[PDB]
């Protein structure tokens, strides 16, 4: 998988971090792992 917060180029490389998924900051360029900014119910982010 990908690192904690890096590019996954292709969107086929899911984040190696639990509850973490690659997201693109734009159309298709800034696609990197994301730990989900769920301040209400965050997963693995301590």
Curated annotation (Swiss-Prot):
Disulfide bonds join 1-16, 8-22, 15-33, 19-43, 24-31. Residues 25-27 are annotated as: Interaction with melanocortin receptors. It is found in: Secreted; Golgi apparatus lumen. Its main location: secreted. GO terms for molecular function: neuropeptide hormone activity; signaling receptor binding; type 1 melanocortin receptor binding. Coiled coil: none annotated. It is linked to Obesity: A condition characterized by an increase of body weight beyond the limitation of skeletal and physical requirements, as the result of excessive accumulation of body fat. Plays a role in weight homeostasis. Involved in the control of feeding behavior through the central melanocortin system. Acts as alpha melanocyte-stimulating hormone antagonist by inhibiting cAMP production mediated by stimulation of melanocortin receptors within the hypothalamus and adrenal gland. Has very low activity with MC5R. Is an inverse agonist for MC3R and MC4R being able to suppress their constitutive activity. It promotes MC3R and MC4R endocytosis in an arrestin-dependent manner. The presence of a 'disulfide through disulfide knot' structurally defines this protein as a knottin. This is Agouti-related protein. It comes from Homo sapiens. The lineage of its organism: Eukaryota, Metazoa, Chordata, Craniata, Vertebrata.
């Amino acid at each position: 998988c990908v690192r904690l917060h890096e590019s996954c180029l292709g969107q086929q490389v899911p984040c190696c971090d639990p509850c973490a998924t690659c997201y693109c900051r734009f159309f298709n360029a800034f696609c990197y792992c994301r730990k989900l900014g769920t301040a209400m119910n965050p997963c693995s982010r301590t």
